[PDB]
Amino acid sequence: SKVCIIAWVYGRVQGVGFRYTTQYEAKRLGLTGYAKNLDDGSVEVVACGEEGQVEKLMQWLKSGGPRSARVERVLSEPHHPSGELTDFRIRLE
């Protein structure tokens, strides 16, 4: 079913078309959400849709996004988006 993630992408990610290309790939994957630049030199991505289509976006982001960019680190939440579909559970760290 429909999962959501939020990812923050650090590196050379602003002013190299990162937002515009995420839009393009997010559409092709039939995903909903948005992308936004932040004051700290990073880009936030919010994406919802089917869990396999979302994971294809997490892979594209992590594999570096567009070719004009140099992604150094990606922090997504949650790390296992499948935990969002389970009737309300408790979990250990």
Curated annotation (Swiss-Prot):
Gene Ontology molecular function:
acylphosphatase activity
SUPFAM superfamilies per the UniProt record, alphabetical: Acylphosphatase/BLUF domain-like (SSF54975)
Using the record's annotation, list all stretches that form the Acylphosphatase-like domain.
4-91
Catalytic residues identified in the record:
R19, N37
User: What Pfam families does UniProt report for this protein, alphabetically?
Assistant: Acylphosphatase (PF00708)
Q: Which domain of life is it from?
A: Bacteria
Q: What is its EC number?
A: 3.6.1.7
Keywords associated with the record? Disulfide bond, Hydrolase
Which cysteines link up through disulfide bonds? C4-C48
Its recorded reaction(s) are: an acyl phosphate + H2O = a carboxylate + phosphate + H(+)
HAMAP family linked to this entry: Acylphosphatase_entero
Query: Which family is it part of?
Result: Belongs to the acylphosphatase family.
For this entry, the protein name equals Acylphosphatase
Species this chain originates from: Escherichia coli O157:H7
Tell me what gene encodes this.
Answer: yccX
